[PDB]
Design a protein around this ligand. Structure first.
Ligand SMILES: *[C@@H]1O[C@H](CO)[C@@H](O[C@@H]2O[C@H](CO)[C@@H](O)[C@H](O)[C@H]2NC(C)=O)[C@H](O)[C@H]1NC(C)=O
Ligand SMILES: *[C@@H]1O[C@H](CO)[C@@H](O)[C@H](O)[C@H]1NC(C)=O
Ligand SMILES: *[C@@H]1O[C@H](CO)[C@@H](O)[C@H](O)[C@H]1NC(C)=O
Ligand SMILES: *[C@@H]1O[C@H](CO)[C@@H](O)[C@H](O)[C@H]1NC(C)=O
Ligand SMILES: *[C@@H]1O[C@H](CO)[C@@H](O)[C@H](O)[C@H]1NC(C)=O
Ligand SMILES: *[C@@H]1O[C@H](CO)[C@@H](O)[C@H](O)[C@H]1NC(C)=O
Ligand SMILES: *[C@@H]1O[C@H](CO)[C@@H](O)[C@H](O)[C@H]1NC(C)=O
Lengths: 110, 829, 196, 42, 361, 152, 79
């Protein structure tokens, strides 16, 4: 449990439930790395960005010259409308799940 | 010469007790002065003194020539420009030179669109046939080119006419080979020229043309080569690749004529910001030398104001020059291989105009070959070692004999640092044959002319950006960009930004330490130099050693005379209190506060009266608090501040939002809001700090608790010493502290009993023999004693040791001046 | 004092004595540390050669020995690195022997060492006394594993590339990992292979 | 003016009552906004 | 959002008059029958491309030949002028070259007759527009018969320039040399210096300017392209002013293969397919019969970097390229050719052979 | 019902603003918020420590203060502007501005936008995006279509 | 789509003028779409390039450590 881990007070949601975005002294982070935004507020990583980072990290294991699916996320964090793997692109719903049908090949308007 | 110099020269020879000061342009200075700056009376162009001005000192900006000629008429009116000089066009709506007498052919009904400058008149006035037939070289704006060049017929010494020879034989001038084959007996002659074009004194340098389509000869490559050689020879003579500027001609003249107002300037050439006449008032001055209308006796507030406008907008470094010159290595190698001045002006002498550098960089295509084309050979390198003196140079008017008589074989009051000039001229040589230089021209040409008039001014603005959101800078009195700028928790003084607390400025010690550390990186390995050591706060350490010789130092790291003992031997040198005493003594008798120090050297408890801590720092006969009483007054003052906050809010005297601005360090000023104690409150929050957060939290808790319907103050004994057992006073976790409040290792039963100052100390001395000194001055191992504590806890009255016994006060184990003084008895004194 | 000093011969001689005394190893080291022996400036050639000699002689062998002592287990190993300190020349003692032996506290050197240096020296004297007593700088008695309070625990040096910790003898006394991975990798692997 | 400067007015082309350049002519706007249109051919 | 153009003027002016652009003979309609000299009409098509919210009509002449189809006995010999006539239907992208590791059976649109350059010229623009001869062999997947692989209409529009996208033969077909006097050469480098003379001559017919071509080339094929920066042409007719090499340079180790390596690098192929590698005249005359499918299943076998790793590249032959590019670059400059060189971290010698590995599996 | 922007995000028959008017309602709301602060201060039911503590993101919950700020908790530049407007007002209007864009009658951005006080009248495209000074002749700039036509 | 449209102008300014910053070879108006692309000078002090990332930031010393190995050391080893 010791794995990982000044005048800071954490926020709290209903019934404990450690609040998402903790702010202090001009910093605000949602802990998890890559969240400290000096000024303003940060955006909690969407489901897409979590799957992107996990697949990117898993990519390092794959031998060079081979590739696998690394879903791409918009600026806000949503899945892109179309997700391609290898010459076969499928339009995806909100949480990155292929829509039935609409599995055309790469390089043709969809 | 002019109406002045004839009078001026006469006075010097005759020694009459007044010399009519006249600036460049050979025109009387508006404000003359007497032989010793006694009474400066202001005059007009003729030289008559105004009847209503003889006052001692300097007249308050006497009226200019134009008006002093204007008001004469009243008892056509000249239109005097705002600077007080004649407007370029009078108004029949003719135009005039810069003296008052109209240019010849300019009488017109309406205002001329643009009529000639001081050079174009001379050229045209030369065709009409008054003057030697050699046209002065005119700057494109119309003024005289700084470096004039008029050829000379070597036989019989008549100037070689050029309005005729160039007019009929323009092909002879295409190159130097062609010229020699048409006029073999011609030897050029270049010199500097003042604003009026008149030849300067002893600055002519008769070049030689033996071994080296356009119009007017002021654009032909002969001239540009024939003045790049002249400027090169000037770099050796004067140290700057340029002719003496308008300021230096006046300063050399002032130093030579020894009159009261000797203008001050710096090697940039521009007039110094402030010229201080000796024997009278000083005053700021502009580039032209005109006195600022009143200054008789830096850019933060503008930046501060502009940032506020960006806040006022509500919701909803030069441009592109850092990332083309400085980022890439087109500039960094330019300075490295002397000064920006010798590099600024080494590209005005070369490439006088941007339309020329474009030509130069497309007909070279070879970095090494550039220095051959510009100077018609390897000139400047041949100038460093004075190989010219026989090759090109020749009898002109500079007296190389006298110049060398002080050397081994200045021009206009320029001290000649011959070694530096040889280094600097060499610098240009390698700088010019440098592949990166060609790229610099390609970029310097591109930058818009509005932000940089000419390639010389292109180079400053790129020097000025060598390093280069919603932040507002602070400001002290009279601009004076404030040292430590805070914003959104950040606070940076400018290589140290630290969050939270207000940072400390690098003391002189720290600056010297950093400079010497950086200079250490250059030194060869195994060698060392002095890197002064600084304490935590920033003061110089009491003793500074270099190599087996240590000298105690004063406040600002200056060795004290004497006390220069060798390393490795105890050196007892002035205590910090005595150093502050002597420093303040010198400072306060040098302006025509005294810290007085205990005989032992430590800061006396009472300083003035008032009382301070052992470091000598100020602490708010006045008896002084003990180790914990002060730590209690701090908490009492904190609670007082919190209640002051609550009762300020209960007065509705402070806007709700300002307290937020302080957290971001945008405390706005009352200089720009003179409506209003307002500042006093904001001092607490401004430096966003743990203390500020605690104070705000306490104030808010109080406000929301006692509006409708705590702080741990330490417990203390009767003598101001820390109680051994400290309790939090409510749900207490009664930890226990040593004799100075420092905690020594829970809602438990039987609140702990912890040893007094001596039971702890005696137990330590018994367990591990860490005894206590008796005399404090190099005790023998017999002077040490283990404190003997009587039963209840205080130090025994009389403490003994193998060497003897002495009486100590039961409060603390500190001796007293002597049966044996008892507690009430020691407290009596 | 004898008069003879650095010369053009020395530059290509010193490098040869220090790093060779081989022909390929010298090329590898000259590239890696950019020892431009032709460049005739002791100010920089020497400054880049002291680093090569320190890596070869002084600081990689004290990592090779630590690793070989931990691997083929011969007993505990605790490695320390004392960062460059620009202050105290004129003492022929470097910042780990003038902190382990209480040089700041000497009567002779009164006023030459800041209280930060004296406190750091006291912590380091405690580390070295704990080692001398128990064999593990964290614990002053070999029969009591109470954790140290004076400074941060000194981690045992385990040679696994994932983490091989040491103690940086600076003011904060922080643990670090991978003392010189690149340079001692060079010397221990590439050069040693190139010896054959 | 010799000092860097009876009825004296220091009008600055771009207390302190706004005006406009002669020949334009101010508008019903008294003292605040936009004003002083350019006078037309009439 | 939207593309907002506006003139650059040296100084303010009261009245500003601009003369409209007059389309060259052939353009203006939606079937721009461009007449190119000594051949006849070359009628392409037009397509409207969206960049922001605003559209620019762009004429597209896809499949403009620049050399006779290297089929049959015109296989391992330099190209030559196609000598076509009448009306070319340059409205559909044509077959792309054979590349190592083409999935079997041969997919649609791969053939030896792959010497075709697509031209993408915006509708109407300045008189003398610039050109960009991008040498790109389309991959197996890109391209749907209606659209070219690399469209280039979008660089043409947002630059107001012409974008010629020439293809060229690479692999054994392009470069099967033997270092000797009978079969040495870089046919794929001789037929991408023929797609630049075509652009030199017949680009005035489009809006282009022969004096402002810009030879570009991508991954790996920029080592072949950069050999033009070191080859000596006649020096009177330069074929490009600039060079945008994306992912290669003349100085790379494999920018040119040594003769003794080339001589044996083809003997392996000749033996592999089944030809008698006794003499070149008898060897090459046998490969000239092998179908491309069988002859390109061989090079992908020899080209895998776990056994032979036989890369085919520009040999030195004296006639076109005479000195190794490293030695040519030592000499002094003769013409100032700008350069926008670069690379990507995703590149890599194993990433380029991706198609070969999938074939080996 | 309600109305949202073309991203679907909530936008506070309910016909509702155009390109600019929404950008103007933000400024109107902002000044409303700033005045809300000044009147809360005038009523004096908040302490200064509360504002600072919120500035550090340490707001206090009424759950642990049962006796009885969203503007300031997020330490964003908008909060800085709001507090600056609040304090500037208070002092100015106790003893004794914000640029809201000029709009047309149909809610579309007016081509020429002026700061309304010592104005540097820049001009914007059809969506408020500035397109490239106390100059005379407050510039005339093209309407939405005169810009599209001139480009086309 | 927005980064690609700043790089289709670097590559179109180069095709037109020969200097990605400037779209006309007779007008050195600085670029506004993205940061200036600095000319590559080989001096070790700064040899700038352009990182084709979202911000298009200039950097320096592309691979000093790795391309000094191949260019300086290994090329020596070739002899
Ligand atoms: C010193 O100057 C002399 C004369 O200017 C130089 O002698 C010339 O040298 C150049 C090349 O260095 C030759 O092209 C000329 O033919 C020489 N002319 C004459 C008359 O000698 C000399 O080189 C310079 N340097 C030294 C060291 O003397
Ligand atoms: C220089 O002087 C001589 C004197 O006889 C004169 O004749 C000659 O013409 C002059 N030079 C030229 C080039 O005319
Ligand atoms: C040069 O300087 C000396 C210094 O007294 C002077 O006497 C001599 O006359 C000068 N020579 C010339 C030619 O001016
Ligand atoms: C604040 O003021 C009111 C009267 O104005 C008073 O009744 C109340 O007790 C005060 N509260 C504090 C905490 O001063
Ligand atoms: C093209 O036709 C001409 C005759 O006009 C001929 O001389 C030339 O050789 C032909 N080219 C080919 C490839 O046949
Ligand atoms: C520019 O355009 C015309 C055709 O419109 C062409 O003939 C001319 O040669 C081109 N310019 C130059 C310098 O060739
Ligand atoms: C609000 O501020 C105004 C202006 O100073 C003042 O008159 C009024 O008293 C304040 N409100 C109250 C309740 O005092």
């Amino acid at each position: 449990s010791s794995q990982g881990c000044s005048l800071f007070v954490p926020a709290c949601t209903a019934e404990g439930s450690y609040e998402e975005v903790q702010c202090f002294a001009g910093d605000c982070w949602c802990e998890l790395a890559g969240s400290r935004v000096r000024g303003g507020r940060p955006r909690c990583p969407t489901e897409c960005e979590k799957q992107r980072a996990r697949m990117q990290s898993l990519l390092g294991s794959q031998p060079a010259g081979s590739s696998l699916f690394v879903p791409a996320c918009t600026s806000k964090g949503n899945f892109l409308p179309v997700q391609c793997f290898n010459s076969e692109c499928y339009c995806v719903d909100t949480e990155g799940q292929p829509i039935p049908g609409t599995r055309s090949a790469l390089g043709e308007p969809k | 010469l002019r109406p002045c110099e004839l009078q001026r020269e006469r006075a010097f020879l005759k020694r009459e007790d007044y010399v009519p000061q006249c600036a460049e342009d050979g025109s009387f200075q508006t404000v003359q002065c007497g032989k010793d700056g006694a009474s400066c009376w202001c005059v007009d162009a003729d030289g008559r003194e105004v009847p209503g001005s003889r006052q001692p000192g300097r007249p308050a900006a006497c009226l200019s020539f134009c008006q002093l000629q204007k008001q004469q008429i009243l008892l056509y009116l000249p239109q005097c420009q705002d600077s007080g000089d004649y407007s370029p066009v009078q108004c029949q709506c003719w135009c005039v030179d810069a003296e008052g007498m109209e240019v010849y052919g300019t009488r017109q009904q309406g205002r001329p669109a643009r009529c000639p400058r001081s050079c174009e008149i001379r050229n045209r006035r030369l065709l009409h046939g008054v003057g030697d037939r050699s046209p002065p070289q005119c700057s494109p704006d119309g003024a005289f080119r700084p470096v004039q060049c008029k050829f000379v017929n070597t036989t019989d010494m008549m100037i070689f006419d050029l309005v005729h020879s160039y007019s009929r034989f323009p092909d002879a001038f295409v190159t130097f080979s062609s010229f020699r084959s048409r006029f073999p007996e011609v030897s050029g002659y270049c010199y500097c020229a003042d604003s009026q074009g008149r030849e300067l004194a002893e600055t002519g340098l008769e070049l030689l043309l033996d071994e080296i389509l356009a119009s007017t000869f002021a654009e032909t490559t002969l001239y540009r080569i024939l003045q790049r050689r002249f400027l090169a020879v000037q770099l050796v003579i004067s140290g700057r690749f340029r002719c003496p500027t308008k300021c230096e001609v006046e300063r050399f003249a002032a130093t030579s004529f020894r009159h009261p107002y000797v203008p001050s300037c710096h090697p940039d050439g521009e007039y110094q910001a402030a010229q201080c006449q000796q024997g009278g008032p000083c005053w700021c001055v502009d580039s032209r030398g005109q006195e600022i209308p009143g200054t008789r006796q830096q850019s933060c507030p503008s930046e501060r104001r502009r940032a506020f406008s960006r806040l006022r907008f509500g919701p909803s470094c030069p441009p592109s020059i850092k990332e083309l010159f400085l980022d890439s290595g087109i500039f960094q190698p330019m300075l490295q291989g002397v000064a920006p001045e010798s590099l600024k002006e080494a590209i005005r002498g070369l490439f006088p105009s941007r339309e020329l550098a474009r030509l130069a960089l497309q007909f070279t295509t070879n970095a090494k070959r550039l220095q051959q084309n510009l100077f018609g050979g390897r000139f400047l390198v041949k100038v460093g070692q004075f190989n010219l003196s026989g090759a090109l140079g020749t009898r002109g008017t500079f007296n190389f004999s006298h110049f060398f008589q002080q050397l081994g074989l200045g021009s206009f009051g320029f001290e000649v640092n011959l070694q530096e000039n040889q280094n600097a001229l060499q610098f240009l040589s390698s700088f010019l044959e440098l592949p990166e230089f060609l790229l610099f021209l390609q970029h310097a040409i591109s930058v818009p002319e509005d932000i940089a008039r000419d390639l010389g001014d292109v180079m400053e603005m790129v020097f000025s950006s060598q390093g280069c959101s919603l932040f507002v800078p602070a400001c002290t009195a009279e601009g004076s960009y404030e040292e430590v700028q805070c914003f959104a928790g950040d606070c940076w003084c400018a290589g140290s930004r630290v969050r939270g607390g207000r940072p400390r400025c690098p003391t002189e010690c720290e600056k010297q330490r950093a400079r010497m550390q950086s200079l250490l990186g250059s030194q060869p390995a195994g060698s060392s130099l002095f890197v002064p050591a600084c304490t935590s706060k920033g003061n110089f350490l009491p003793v500074q050693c270099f190599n087996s010789e240590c000298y105690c130092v004063d406040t600002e790291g200056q060795p004290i005379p004497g006390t220069r003992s060798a390393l490795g031997e105890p050196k007892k040198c002035p205590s910090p209190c005595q150093l502050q005493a002597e420093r303040a003594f010198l400072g306060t008798v040098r302006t025509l506060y005294i810290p007085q120090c205990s005989a032992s050297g430590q800061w006396s408890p009472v300083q003035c009266c008032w009382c301070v801590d052992e470091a000598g720092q100020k602490l708010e006969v006045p008896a002084c608090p003990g180790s914990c009483e002060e730590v209690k007054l701090r908490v009492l003052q904190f609670i007082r501040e919190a209640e002051e906050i609550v009762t300020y809010s209960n007065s509705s005297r402070f806007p709700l939002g300002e307290s937020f601005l302080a957290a971001k360090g945008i405390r706005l000023t009352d200089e720009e809001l003179a409506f209003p104690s307002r500042e006093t409150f904001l001092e607490k929050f401004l430096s966003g700090s743990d203390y500020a957060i605690r104070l705000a939290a306490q104030s808010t808790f109080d406000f929301y608790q006692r509006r409708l319907v705590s702080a741990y103050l330490p417990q203390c004994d009767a003598f101001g010493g820390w109680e051994p057992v400290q309790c939090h006073a409510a749900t207490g976790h009664c930890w226990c502290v040593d004799g100075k409040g420092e905690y020594v290792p829970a809602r438990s039963r039987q609140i702990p009993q912890c040893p007094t100052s001596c039971e702890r100390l005696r137990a330590s001395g018994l367990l591990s023999s860490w005894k206590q000194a008796g005399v404090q001055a190099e005790p023998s191992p017999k002077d040490l004693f283990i404190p003997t504590c009587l039963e209840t806890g205080e130090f025994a009255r009389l403490q003994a040791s193998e060497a003897g016994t002495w009486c100590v006060d039961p409060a603390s184990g500190e001796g007293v001046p002597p049966q044996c003084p008892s507690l009430c008895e020691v407290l009596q004194s | 004092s004898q008069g003879r000093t650095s010369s053009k011969t020395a530059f290509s001689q010193a490098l040869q004595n220090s790093l060779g005394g081989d022909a390929g190893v010298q090329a590898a080291a000259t590239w890696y540390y950019s020892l431009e022996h032709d460049s005739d400036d002791x100010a920089s050639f020497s400054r880049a050669l002291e680093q090569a000699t320190r890596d070869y002689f002084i600081i990689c062998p004290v990592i090779d020995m630590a690793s070989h002592w931990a691997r083929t287990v011969r007993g505990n190993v605790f490695m320390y690195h004392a960062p460059e300190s620009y202050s105290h020349s004129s003492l022929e003692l470097l910042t780990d022997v003038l902190y382990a032996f209480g040089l700041p506290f000497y009567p002779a050197y009164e006023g030459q060492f800041t209280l930060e240096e004296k406190s750091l020296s006291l912590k380091i004297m405690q580390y070295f006394s704990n080692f001398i007593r128990s064999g593990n700088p964290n614990y002053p008695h070999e029969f009591s594993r109470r954790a140290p309070e004076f400074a941060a625990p000194w981690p045992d040096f385990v040679p696994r590339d994932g983490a091989e910790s040491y103690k940086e003898l600076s003011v904060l006394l922080p643990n670090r990992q991978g003392l010189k991975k690149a340079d001692c990798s060079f010397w221990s692997k590439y050069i040693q292979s190139l010896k054959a | 003016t010799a000092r860097g400067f009876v009825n004296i007015t220091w009008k600055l082309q771009l207390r302190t009552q706004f005006g406009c350049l002669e020949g334009f002519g101010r508008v019903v706007a008294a003292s605040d906004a936009l004003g002083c249109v350019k006078c037309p051919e009439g | 959002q939207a593309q907002n153009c506006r003139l650059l003027l040296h100084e303010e002016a009261t009245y500003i008059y601009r003369k409209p652009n007059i389309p060259l003979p052939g353009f203006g309609t939606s079937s721009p029958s461009v007449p190119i000299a000594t051949h006849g009409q070359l009628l392409g098509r037009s397509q409207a491309i969206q960049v922001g919210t605003s559209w620019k009509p762009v004429d597209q002449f896809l499949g403009v030949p620049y050399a006779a189809p290297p089929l049959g006995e015109k296989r391992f010999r330099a190209p030559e002028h196609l000598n076509w006539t009448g009306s070319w239907e340059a409205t559909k992208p044509r077959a792309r070259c054979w590349q190592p590791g083409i999935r079997t059976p041969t997919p649609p649109g791969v053939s030896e007759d792959c010497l075709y350059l697509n031209v993408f010229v915006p509708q109407n623009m300045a008189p003398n527009a610039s050109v960009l001869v991008f040498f790109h062999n389309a991959a197996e997947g890109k391209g749907s018969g209606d659209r070219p692989a690399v469209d280039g209409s979008f660089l043409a529009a947002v630059g107001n320039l012409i974008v010629v996208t020439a293809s060229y033969r690479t692999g054994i077909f392009g470069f099967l040399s033997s270092g000797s006097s009978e079969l040495s050469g870089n046919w794929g480098l001789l037929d991408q210096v023929v797609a630049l003379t075509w652009v030199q001559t017949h680009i005035q017919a489009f809006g282009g300017d022969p004096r402002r071509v810009t030879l570009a080339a991508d991954r790996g094929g920029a080592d072949i392209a950069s050999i033009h920066l070191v080859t000596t042409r006649a020096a009177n007719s330069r074929l490009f002013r600039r060079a945008v090499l994306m992912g290669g340079s003349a100085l790379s180790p494999a920018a040119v293969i040594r003769p003794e390596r080339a001589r044996q690098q083809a003997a392996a192929l000749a033996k592999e397919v089944g030809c008698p590698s006794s003499s070149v005249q008898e060897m090459v005359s046998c490969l000239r019969q092998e179908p491309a499918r069988i002859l390109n299943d061989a090079q992908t076998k020899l080209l895998a970097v776990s056994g032979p790793f036989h890369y085919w590249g520009p040999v030195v032959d004296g006639q076109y390229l005479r000195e190794t590019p490293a030695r040519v670059l030592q000499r002094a400059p003769r013409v100032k050719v700008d350069l926008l060189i670069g690379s990507s971290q995703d590149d890599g010698l194993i990433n380029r052979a991706k198609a070969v590995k999938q074939f080996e599996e």
